[PDB]
Amino acid sequence: ANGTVMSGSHWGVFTATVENGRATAFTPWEKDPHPSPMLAGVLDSIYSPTRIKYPMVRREFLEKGVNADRSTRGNGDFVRVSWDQALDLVAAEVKRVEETYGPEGVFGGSYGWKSPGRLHNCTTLLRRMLTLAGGYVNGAGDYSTGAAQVIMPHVVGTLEVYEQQTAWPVLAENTEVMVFWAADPIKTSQIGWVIPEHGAYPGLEALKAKGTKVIVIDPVRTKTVEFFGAEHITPKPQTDVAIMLGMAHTLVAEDLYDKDFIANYTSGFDKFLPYLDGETDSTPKTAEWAEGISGVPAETIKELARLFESKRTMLAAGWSMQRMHHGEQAHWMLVTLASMLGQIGLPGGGFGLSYHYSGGGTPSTSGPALAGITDGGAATKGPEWLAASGASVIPVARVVDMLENPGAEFDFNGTRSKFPDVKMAYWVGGNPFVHHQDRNRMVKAWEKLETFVVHDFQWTPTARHADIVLPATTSYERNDIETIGDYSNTGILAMKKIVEPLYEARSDYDIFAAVAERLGKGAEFTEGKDEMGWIKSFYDDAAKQGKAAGVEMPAFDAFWAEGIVEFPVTDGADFVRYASFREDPLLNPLGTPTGLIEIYSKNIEKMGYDDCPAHPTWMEPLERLDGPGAKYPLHIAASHPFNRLHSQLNGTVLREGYAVQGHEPCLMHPDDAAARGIADGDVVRVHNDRGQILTGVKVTDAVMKGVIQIYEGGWYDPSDVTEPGTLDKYGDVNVLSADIGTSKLAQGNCGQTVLAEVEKYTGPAVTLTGFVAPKAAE
Ligand SMILES: NC1=NC(=O)C2=N[C@H]3C(S)=C(S)[C@@H](COP(=O)(O)OP(=O)(O)OC[C@H]4O[C@@H](n5cnc6c(=O)[nH]c(N)nc65)[C@H](O)[C@@H]4O)O[C@H]3NC2=N1
Numbered sequence: 001a002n003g004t005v006m007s008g009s010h011w012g013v014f015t016a017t018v019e020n021g022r023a024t025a026f027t028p029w030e031k032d033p034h035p036s037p038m039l040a041g042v043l044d045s046i047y048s049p050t051r052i053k054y055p056m057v058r059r060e061f062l063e064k065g066v067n068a069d070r071s072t073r074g075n076g077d078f079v080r081v082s083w084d085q086a087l088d089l090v091a092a093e094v095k096r097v098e099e100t101y102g103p104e105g106v107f108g109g110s111y112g113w114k115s116p117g118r119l120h121n122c123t124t125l126l127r128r129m130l131t132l133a134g135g136y137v138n139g140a141g142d143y144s145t146g147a148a149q150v151i152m153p154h155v156v157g158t159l160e161v162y163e164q165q166t167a168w169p170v171l172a173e174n175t176e177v178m179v180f181w182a183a184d185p186i187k188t189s190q191i192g193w194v195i196p197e198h199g200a201y202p203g204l205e206a207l208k209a210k211g212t213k214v215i216v217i218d219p220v221r222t223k224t225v226e227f228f229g230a231e232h233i234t235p236k237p238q239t240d241v242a243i244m245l246g247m248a249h250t251l252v253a254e255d256l257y258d259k260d261f262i263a264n265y266t267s268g269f270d271k272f273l274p275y276l277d278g279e280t281d282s283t284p285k286t287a288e289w290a291e292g293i294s295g296v297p298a299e300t301i302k303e304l305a306r307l308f309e310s311k312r313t314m315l316a317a318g319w320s321m322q323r324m325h326h327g328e329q330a331h332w333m334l335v336t337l338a339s340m341l342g343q344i345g346l347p348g349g350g351f352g353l354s355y356h357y358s359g360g361g362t363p364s365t366s367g368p369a370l371a372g373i374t375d376g377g378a379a380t381k382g383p384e385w386l387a388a389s390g391a392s393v394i395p396v397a398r399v400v401d402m403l404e405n406p407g408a409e410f411d412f413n414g415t416r417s418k419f420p421d422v423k424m425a426y427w428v429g430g431n432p433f434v435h436h437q438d439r440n441r442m443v444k445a446w447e448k449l450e451t452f453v454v455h456d457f458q459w460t461p462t463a464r465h466a467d468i469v470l471p472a473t474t475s476y477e478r479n480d481i482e483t484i485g486d487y488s489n490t491g492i493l494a495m496k497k498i499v500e501p502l503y504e505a506r507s508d509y510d511i512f513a514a515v516a517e518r519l520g521k522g523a524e525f526t527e528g529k530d531e532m533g534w535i536k537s538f539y540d541d542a543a544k545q546g547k548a549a550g551v552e553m554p555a556f557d558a559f560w561a562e563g564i565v566e567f568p569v570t571d572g573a574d575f576v577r578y579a580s581f582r583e584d585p586l587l588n589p590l591g592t593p594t595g596l597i598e599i600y601s602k603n604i605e606k607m608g609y610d611d612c613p614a615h616p617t618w619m620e621p622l623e624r625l626d627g628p629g630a631k632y633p634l635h636i637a638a639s640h641p642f643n644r645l646h647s648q649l650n651g652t653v654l655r656e657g658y659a660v661q662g663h664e665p666c667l668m669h670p671d672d673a674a675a676r677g678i679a680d681g682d683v684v685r686v687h688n689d690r691g692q693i694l695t696g697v698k699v700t701d702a703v704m705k706g707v708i709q710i711y712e713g714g715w716y717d718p719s720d721v722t723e724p725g726t727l728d729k730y731g732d733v734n735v736l737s738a739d740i741g742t743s744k745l746a747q748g749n750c751g752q753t754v755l756a757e758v759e760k761y762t763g764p765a766v767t768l769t770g771f772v773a774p775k776a777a778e
């Protein structure tokens, strides 16, 4: 096999060079305006030393089954087995758990970023098989906008976080002041949930070319700051709401805010005002009060408030500030501040919660939607699940609380239910042993599972902790179809097979059709179709919709031969979010009970949640930098990796470009380094009451004083899985996070509410074992 093949991924469209059946180079699509350097690691992930070769069974589970000693999961003691033995065993375990415990005994939430592709959607495929097996417990929401996606529907009446933004070109022509609040779009625009078009880069470039004022509010001097030479505001992490309240207070005290916009488009500001003024608690939320909490100068806070009120301003907020205790307050208070500015719905004004994600704001084309295989759920009646058997769904980040407290009650967005009693967890396309908070608690809670099954193509910590590991193929070893552009709908791509499945790896589709076949539902899982039958069915449906919309597309074979279809932009570049509501709120009301922006929410008031009041409120978090009585001195900006997609690509050649002494890097301010005797490049121990990890320090004033940056996604590498609190040799920041809910409203994760201490490491030397396969899988 010596040629070139085009395909796509979460990092973008690309062309692979193949030489005697091996992919040797991934070259970015010629129309990608800003490719990601991570493509080199994508290619490397097909072949790296942590590629999973064969199906494996954890020796203790192979020998003892449910009586296994579960405290040794993760020690790497696996036995290689044949595909037939492993499929029989997985099918027997699914049947056994379903029969013995009901669907409530099987957790199938399997949260994860997987790979794009309408056919090879491993998490949907898992659920298609589990539906056929009798059912399963699902997850609700995600780790990205756990809080924001639940509070927005109460406030603005829509999901908001995953909806199209005012178009980039409308911003270049109308916005005078662009604010990136807790957003680093240069960093996070590299990837897409579906194939990315990188539409933010030309949008950002156009703002810079127009000379538009840009202000970044972030504890770290990011590349977004650098790109624009932006005015950079450095709040102590977790104090943005106090700053917003200080700005709002200033707008009232100086009599500047838009009273008309508040009277005509919002509901409940009159119940928020007294609190803002301090009438209810003797604590006027002044700029000075906000300086006390956040560290940002009171005069800067007022000057920003005045600037935003006097110029067409776009508040482009990111999501790290809601992935925290009381996370709901952040975007609720931002919308409240934006309502006080009165520019929601005007070209270039208001707010936007997706300018830093998957091309939000890239103009949408007139093309049709593309849909892929489904879980079969809307197809034969799932039996009756009664409340006594527990909820059939949990907020995703409550997975460990669930395992630890079967039958216990939990509150979620106005409803109380009981946790189901789960005995089996099946995970594909996700890495919970890296993405979930409080690794030491989670490691212990996993002992409640009888059986844990994982499919991946990389030996992640999650694969290392499974009882049964099945090697999946990458997208580059099969064919698929997918949209380019979560919002732009730039076109549809043929994700063409580049190389044959490596080693004994199999698509998740093939695996699940095999398990389903052993359960007696083979035909039902495949629907009588094969890989191209499924792909052509999705395409044809897309084509039928396009033909009916005046966007006719070629026949399938013709589309597949070209490898792509691109669609025309009609009016998508003119899109202004909230314009129709602004233009006539009686004709175009929002989906809230009042039809208006709810600054005070009667529906939330009725829930009676102490941690989620009925108007945006400054509440003390579990821990925050310089909080009164806080134990630990440094805030960890546990944010998204520049050179990984979460944990993805950790076990590739890219790792050498950022690792420090082989460990995940930790940014630290020179003053904080010097106070601990720490030198740039030193191995340091980062620890709190929940865990301890090793990182390699990079001393830089890019991180504000009091804050260290350790990205999420590091492959957890425990020194000894049987030792509680064991040191993590590589640097998974989730060993240090707490596992608590943003509040009772959303139950989102608080992965960025983290305080810790750092010292030069003086323990025993460490050997990294997470970047090579377990000995028996070699
Ligand atoms: N402290 C902290 N701060 C954060 O900001 C933070 N972010 C959170 C968020 S928003 C997210 S979404 C999570 C990410 O958590 P997530 O589990 O989504 O992370 P990934 O590293 O994308 O794991 C995806 C896995 O799927 C595997 N895979 C890819 N394609 C396939 C396939 O076709 N088949 C199979 N079987 N496997 C496949 C990949 O190899 C990889 O191991 O981390 C969350 N955790 C976080 N913690």
Ligand SMILES: NC1=NC(=O)C2=N[C@H]3C(S)=C(S)[C@@H](COP(=O)(O)OP(=O)(O)OC[C@H]4O[C@@H](n5cnc6c(=O)[nH]c(N)nc65)[C@H](O)[C@@H]4O)O[C@H]3NC2=N1
Residues within 6 Å of the ligand: 143, 144, 145, 181, 182, 183, 184, 187, 188, 189, 190, 191, 217, 218, 219, 220, 222, 235, 236, 237, 238, 239, 240, 317, 318, 319, 320, 321, 323, 356, 357, 637, 638, 639, 640, 641, 642, 643, 644, 645, 646, 752
């Ligand atoms: N390169 C890359 N890697 C990825 O893993 C990745 N993941 C994707 C996913 S699923 C999503 S959800 C998004 C995540 O998009 P999200 O906006 O949640 O990104 P983060 O990197 O967690 O935080 C963005 C910025 O917030 C700053 N910040 C942290 N705490 C605070 C705070 O208290 N106040 C303020 N004002 N700023 C704070 C951080 O320093 C960081 O620069 O990116 C997506 N894109 C991604 N790109």
